[PDB]
Amino acid sequence: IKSLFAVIIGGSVGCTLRWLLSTKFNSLFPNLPPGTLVVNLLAGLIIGTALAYFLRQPHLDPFWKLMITTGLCGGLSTFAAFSVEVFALLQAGNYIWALTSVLVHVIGSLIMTALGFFIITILFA
Amino acid sequence: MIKSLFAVIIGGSVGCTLRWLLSTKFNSLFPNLPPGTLVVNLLAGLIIGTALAYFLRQPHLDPFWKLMITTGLCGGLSTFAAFSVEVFALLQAGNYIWALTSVLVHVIGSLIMTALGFFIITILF
Amino acid sequence: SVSSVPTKLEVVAATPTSLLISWDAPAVTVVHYVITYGETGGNSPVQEFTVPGSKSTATISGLKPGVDYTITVYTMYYSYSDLYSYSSPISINYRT
Amino acid sequence: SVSSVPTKLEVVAATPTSLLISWDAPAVTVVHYVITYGETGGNSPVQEFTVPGSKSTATISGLKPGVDYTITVYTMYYSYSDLYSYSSPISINYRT
Ligand SMILES: CCCCCCCCCCO[C@@H]1O[C@H](CO)[C@@H](O[C@H]2O[C@H](CO)[C@@H](O)[C@H](O)[C@H]2O)[C@H](O)[C@H]1O
Ligand SMILES: CCCCCCCCCCO[C@@H]1O[C@H](CO)[C@@H](O[C@H]2O[C@H](CO)[C@@H](O)[C@H](O)[C@H]2O)[C@H](O)[C@H]1O
Ligand SMILES: CCCCCCCCCCO[C@@H]1O[C@H](CO)[C@@H](O[C@H]2O[C@H](CO)[C@@H](O)[C@H](O)[C@H]2O)[C@H](O)[C@H]1O
Ligand SMILES: [Br-]
Ligand SMILES: [Br-]
Ligand code: NA
């Protein structure tokens, strides 16, 4: 029950952020909507740092780990929007940006996780 | 912007709690490509794809329900961060074959479930 | 707030029995365009055909010489809020 | 409900100064195993080194012939709930 509040409090902030970020920005470059991208990189950044930090503090309350990863990162990022955008571009005959959207999101959100992880790995050393 | 905010939170928490519950039950059952996170992304891929084609035929739907389904439920039910850590974890563990498989199955499987949801409903109507 | 409607719809080439129409795409992911045409004198049926979202021109053929036609073009586009929807039309009158 | 601790840890090949330890990997994604070993008796400094997760074996060297050693092995693994965390250890004795 206390864990369901971590997911709901953490996931509400993330869903709200992804919403405010996705409407205020997505329409500016329809070939690769940038609101659905920043939340995914920013959530990839946060999960990467969450990865390295939670390792060095094994005694953290699972409430705060749940709020940041399953809640915040989970709500903030989104596969659905990334699909319809790519599905929209495939149905529009825009194969080059469908492939680029896929390539950028995946290569990018991994690079943003490796960045968050090693920045904390390196700061602790 | 206050009513619009509730649609994102309600649908999102339902989406998030959903993703939380499904992920802790099934994720451990096959760690090379966790099935929990894979279902909520195929499911949301299905739900957004059907929402893609049903919203097209009902152009007078309250933006409250479209917001609660797409940005909230589909937005919260799905995640990109957990698919990034699981790929970054397979990479730091040298399971390169499965890291690549996880990228393909999520990207391709979620577009199919979006086309499935779209054309299943396009064909009904 | 980004307009989904095309702009500068115009007949760039004409014979007595065909029109080459063109337009300028909107600032949105456009999946396909619908071109609609028919006799302006509301005494004739309307025809519609899709063109891919990559094309910004279309040929209307089989027309009657010396007749006034209304030509309209609207989009089926992906936005973030509305997902798939149909934009309002841009319309021109043109006599062959 | 899936244990992160390795199982069936045994010295499989031995010489007077080295031990080849092997283990069964847990059904979790393991990033690296941590091998530790010290002289069973009392207060010798326990030494430890990491082995990549793809490997399930490890060689320990620089030991004195005729000494009882305590070789423990645990994991740095990824589970969905804890992200990166450490496992409880599995341990053996072996006298060279
Ligand atoms: C990596 C795999 C992911 C899963 C699979 C996703 C598949 C998504 C696209 C399916 O939808 C079709 O795409 C065609 C190509 O865009 C469109 O052709 C339309 O546009 C073409 C443009 O060349 C025209 O030639 C066609 O006549 C016209 O129907 C067609 O309408 C549309 O229904
Ligand atoms: C195309 C998208 C790219 C996005 C960015 C991807 C970044 C990936 C980072 C992976 O992190 C490294 O992975 C190595 C390989 O797994 C590990 O080597 C470890 O594992 C190897 C294989 O088991 C051993 O050979 C090494 O000695 C051992 O240090 C290493 O520790 C770890 O930090
Ligand atoms: C697009 C960019 C792609 C490349 C990204 C970087 C991949 C290579 C990393 C090289 O640096 C590594 O740093 C690790 C520490 O972070 C070391 O891990 C050592 O320590 C780790 C724990 O900190 C263990 O898990 C490892 O097995 C052990 O080799 C490892 O020796 C060292 O080489
Ligand atoms: Br997550
Ligand atoms: Br979404
Ligand atoms: Na989400």
Secondary structure (DSSP) of D10-34: EEEEE-SS-EEEEEEPPSSEEEEEE
Neighbours of B14 (CB within 10 A): 17
Type of residue numbered B112: I
Given resolution (angstroms):
3.1
Ligand 3 pocket, mutate which of D30, D34, D50 (most atoms under 8 A from CB):
D50
Closest CA to B86 of B101, B71, B73, B102: B102
Q: What are phi and psi of B68, to 5 degrees?
A: -70, -30
On the 0-12 / 13-18 / 19+ scale of CB atoms within 10 A, D27 is middle
Cβ–Cβ below 8 Å for B8 and A22? no
Residue in the structure block whose two tokens are 């290569």: A107
Q: Are D6 and D25 in contact (CB under 8 A)?
A: yes
Cβ–Cβ below 8 Å for B93 and D81? no
Q: Are A113 and B86 in contact (CB under 8 A)?
A: no
The DSSP 8-state label assigned to residue A69 in this structure reads I
- What is the distance between the alpha carbons of residues B54 and C84, in angstroms, rounded to a whole number? 9
**Strand-pair category, D83-86 with D68-79:** antiparallel
Question: Residue D62: how many CA atoms within 13 Å on its side-chain side?
Answer: 5
Angle between helices B3-26 and B35-57 (to 10 degrees): 150
Confirm or deny that B75 is annotated as ligand binding.
Answer: yes
Q: Which residues of C touch A33 (CB under 8 A)?
A: 80
Task: Write out the DSSP string of B16-56.
Answer: HHHHHHHHHHHGGG-TTS-HHHHHHHHHHHHHHHHHHHHHH
Residue in the structure block whose two tokens are 């329900």: B65
C57-60 — which CB contacts under 8 Å span 24+ positions? C57/C12, C57/C20, C57/C21, C57/C22, C57/C23, C58/C20, C58/C21, C58/C33, C59/C18, C59/C19, C59/C20, C59/C21, C60/C18, C60/C19, C60/C21, C60/C35
Domain ranges of chain D: 1-96
Cβ–Cβ below 8 Å for C84 and B52? yes
- What is the distance between the alpha carbons of residues A121 and B33, in angstroms, rounded to a whole number? 25
Q: Are B99 and B91 in contact (CB under 8 A)?
A: yes
Buried residues in B51-64 as b, exposed as e (16+ CB within 10 A): bbbbbbeeeeeeee
- What is the distance between the alpha carbons of residues B73 and B112, in angstroms, rounded to a whole number? 19
Q: Are A85 and A99 in contact (CB under 8 A)?
A: no
Residue contacts between A and D (CB atoms, under 8 Å): 21
- What is the distance between the alpha carbons of residues A49 and B88, in angstroms, rounded to a whole number? 12
Type of residue numbered B102: S
Q: Ligand 2 pocket, B59 CB below 6 A? A: no
Q: Which residues pair with C86 in a beta bridge?
A: C76
- What is the distance between the alpha carbons of residues A41 and A111, in angstroms, rounded to a whole number? 9
Task: Write out the DSSP string of C70-87.
Answer: EEEEEEEEEETTTEEEEP
Residue nearest to atom 10 of ligand 2 (CA): B92
Closest CA to D53 of A113, B28, B98, A59: B98
Q: Which residues pair with C71 in a beta bridge?
A: C37, C92
Cβ–Cβ below 8 Å for D29 and B27? no
- What is the distance between the alpha carbons of residues C62 and C82, in angstroms, rounded to a whole number? 36
Q: Ligand 1 pocket, A88 CB below 6 A? A: no
Query: Is the four-CA dihedral C49, C55, C56, C61 of positive or negative sign?
Result: negative
Type of residue numbered A12: S
- The CA C28 to ligand 2 mean position distance, Å, reads 40
Type of residue numbered D66: G
Q: Measured between CB atoms, which of B34, B89, B94 is closest to D52?
A: B94
C85-90 — which CB contacts under 8 Å span 24+ positions? C85/B55, C85/B56, C85/B59, C85/C4, C86/B56, C86/B59, C86/C34, C87/C4, C87/C5, C87/C6, C87/C26, C88/C4, C88/C5, C89/C5, C89/C36, C90/C5, C90/C6, C90/C7, C90/C9, C90/C23
- What is the distance between the alpha carbons of residues C95 and C6, in angstroms, rounded to a whole number? 21
- The CA C17 to ligand 2 mean position distance, Å, reads 67
Neighbours of C7 (CB within 10 A): 11
Question: Residue B62: how many CA atoms within 13 Å on its side-chain side?
Answer: 6
- What is the distance between the alpha carbons of residues D17 and D67, in angstroms, rounded to a whole number? 9
A29-35 — which CB contacts under 8 Å span 24+ positions? A30/C27, A30/C28, A30/C29, A30/C78, A31/A89, A31/A94, A31/A97, A31/A100, A31/A101, A31/C29, A32/A85, A32/A97, A32/A100, A32/A101, A32/A104, A33/A81, A33/A85, A33/C80, A35/C80
Nearest CA in chain C to B68: C81
Helix (H) or strand (E) holding D45: none
Residue in the structure block whose two tokens are 């950028």: A104
Resolved by = X-ray
3-state secondary structure of C27: coil
**H-only helix segments in A1-125:** 2-25, 35-56, 62-66, 74-76, 80-91, 95-123
Closest CA to D47 of D30, D34, D28, D57: D34
- The CA A43 to ligand 4 mean position distance, Å, reads 9
- What is the distance between the alpha carbons of residues B26 and D30, in angstroms, rounded to a whole number? 18
For D17, the token pair is 């100064």
3-state secondary structure of D70: strand
Nearest CA in chain B to D3: B28
Report B:8-47 residues touching D (Cβ under 8 A).
23-24, 27-29, 31-32, 34, 36-37
Q: What is the CA radius of gyration of chain C?
A: 14
On the 0-12 / 13-18 / 19+ scale of CB atoms within 10 A, C15 is exposed
On the 0-12 / 13-18 / 19+ scale of CB atoms within 10 A, A18 is buried
Neighbours of D75 (CB within 10 A): 25
Q: Are C68 and C76 in contact (CB under 8 A)?
A: no
Query: What are the residues whose beta carbons fall under 8 Å from the beta carbon of B77, sequence distance 6 or more?
Result: A80, B14, B15, B16, B18, B19, B40, B43, B44, B47
